[PDB]
Amino acid sequence: RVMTRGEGVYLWDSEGNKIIDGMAGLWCVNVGYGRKDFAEAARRQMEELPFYNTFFKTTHPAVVELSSLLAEVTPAGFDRVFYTNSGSESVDTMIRMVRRYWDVQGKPEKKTLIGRWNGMAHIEQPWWYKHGKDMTPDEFGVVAARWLEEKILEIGADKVAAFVGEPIQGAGGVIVPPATYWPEIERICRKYDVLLVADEVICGFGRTGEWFGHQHFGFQPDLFTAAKGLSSGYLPIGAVFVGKRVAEGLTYSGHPVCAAVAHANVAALRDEGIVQRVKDDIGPYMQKRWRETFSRFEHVDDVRGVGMVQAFTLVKNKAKRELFPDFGEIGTLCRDIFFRNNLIMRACGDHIVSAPPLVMTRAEVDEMLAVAERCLEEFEQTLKARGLA
Amino acid sequence: RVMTRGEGVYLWDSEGNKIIDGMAGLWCVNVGYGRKDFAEAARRQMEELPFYNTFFKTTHPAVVELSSLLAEVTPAGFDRVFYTNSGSESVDTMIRMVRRYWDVQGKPEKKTLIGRWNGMAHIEQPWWYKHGKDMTPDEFGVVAARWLEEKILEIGADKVAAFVGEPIQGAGGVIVPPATYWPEIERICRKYDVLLVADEVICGFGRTGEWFGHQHFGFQPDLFTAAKGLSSGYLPIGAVFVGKRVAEGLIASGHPVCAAVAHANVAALRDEGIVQRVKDDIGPYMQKRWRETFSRFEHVDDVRGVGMVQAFTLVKNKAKRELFPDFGEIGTLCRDIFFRNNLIMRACGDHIVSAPPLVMTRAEVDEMLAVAERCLEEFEQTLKARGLA
Ligand code: NA
Ligand code: NA
């Protein structure tokens, strides 16, 4: 099978089958497929001026225009932006910046960054279904955030540079933390004089209904990182957005052609009302319909989501919060059913996740959920037959 | 001062000044500026199919086409290519591959990579002018290579995964190793069961007259890495080329738009005879003329280069091989003169380096060197006038 075409939320193959891309590429095709206007933006920039040499102390006008527009949609205080070619480069750049910041502050010892599972250290993820015991989600959020305080005290605050986290952990199975989590993380970071970094690789550019995930969860990072969601994936790009504290402690970056396409993308997300529509219209619709569709199944639990990112977990016994053995095997079984039915929704372990293009219509939401629901019927029937139910 | 246009080896500013780009952007605009055909390649790919989903078990046709073409210009045995968005990503990917290779081989202790100055370790660079003492270059090449053996023995061979090096160290000042160096490096790597990796960030895509620097020096690495020279910089891209031994060990990618541009670039380099012309024609001319132009100056020594990469070093006393103090200050002085005269040649410490687009004509070589020559005359006079001669 070869892919021949994409438009909106759909991909087409050489056999003429229409496939619903419920993952928007790599969680990043937020304006959807088929933006021929972006092709023109790239063509024009490459015909005119695809380079800009550091010999000149000025900045390529496409990059200037992108930065000016980004400033309008990012939170106040993020006036320094460092462009990269990818999320990976953004993470590397962020790490170097955090460390340099502390060097400049006269604290070169402060070099370790702390992140989460699913000069490095890691803490457990705020996954209540697995780790919550008989705590309420609110109680658990405080406990899970305090794992950061524990790790800071273990390493020593004078050696810790920063905590880095995705507002919602995407690759981890869309683990949505309790409401109490990020405020406690923030208290802990500020208490121990540790920088706070939001990784917006998946939550960026409208995914949660706000422009950035950290805005939805109401925390104020010192920096945040972005990947190719910045261009809806149409060309490789990323960025590190630097807040006032770190900027003060610390011009040429950005491939001009990719910047021109990113500018067209961000302008579309704003001017065509796409992000606002997630917040006001399609987000709440998706979240309601997602929950109406999946909550009833015997082996589905923890149905969850915000804006246009959503998920659930396949489980052996809901009443016991008992997961299937060999976490991942059942998810793969379920994912194969979706794929056989020309629906792209992926599995992380036994979590099923979705992040369709933000432009998805209500009818398209219901179309996707109808296929998914039919697939889950088959999944449940298949479990029974294999004696795994 | 704003850049407004580029064509061939030239850039122009908003005042209409012509600037000679003797560095080809970031050592990478090998086909030159002004390739309007590349804009069309990008437009067409973005109009038709800028994405390709892993849902399909096939590869995007532009990537297939690029790989097929690359296979015709790389050495035998490199039939696995992993595409990235940049040189930096290529290095990261290579490091993960070399470590995974050894894990699969059942030698999980092999994790350290060794490189050179200018989980990681470093050895000294084969810079004869500084380190050669009373050795001939050939004798020094063997000694400098044996620094790798000394380092491997210090660490423990069973802990060492790979040695990584640029065939000619570009950012280090175009340090061209003696003829004896790379064969001894290779021998040592084989002796200690260490992988050999060539970093083609600057030597790649025709810079030395061969397609790749490792070919010029006659060694066969197990992997090699490339950066955006693969597209002459027109879009972000990189790659890791994986040899048979490693590819098979692992068995036991690519943004389609960037791939389409890279394919146009490689096709041009080949079909327009650009690389062949470096080997047979412009390279030998550049090297001769570079040496004729610079060798006579009292404070210039170690005039060097291969193909279309060349350099020299500003020195306090040639007879004594005595460098200026505060290495870098004099290079900056000289570079500033170049820039004032609208010539882009850069300084790496007190090394002056050049790597112009490969399409430079003989007339353009002479034009560039005539400017550089006048700048060196000024440099010598300013040195005397400052009492630094
Ligand atoms: Na802002
Ligand atoms: Na080959």
TrEMBL record, chain B:
InterPro entries per record: Aminotrans_3 (IPR005814), Aminotrans_3_PPA_site (IPR049704), PyrdxlP-dep_Trfase (IPR015424), PyrdxlP-dep_Trfase_major (IPR015421), PyrdxlP-dep_Trfase_small (IPR015422)
Cofactor: pyridoxal 5'-phosphate
EC number, UniProt record: 2.6.1.62
Cellular-component GO terms for this entry: cytosol
GO molecular function: adenosylmethionine-8-amino-7-oxononanoate transaminase activity; identical protein binding; pyridoxal phosphate binding
Keyword hit for Cytoplasm: no
N6-(pyridoxal phosphate)lysine (covalent): residues carrying this PTM: K228
Domain of life: Bacteria
Binding-site list for pyridoxal 5'-phosphate: G87, S88
Keywords (A to Z) from UniProt: Aminotransferase, Pyridoxal phosphate, Transferase
Protein's UniProt keywords contain Protein transport: no
Top-level enzyme category: transferase
NCBIfam families in the record: PRK07480.1 (NF005682)
Family: Belongs to the class-III pyridoxal-phosphate-dependent aminotransferase family.
Protein name: Probable aminotransferase
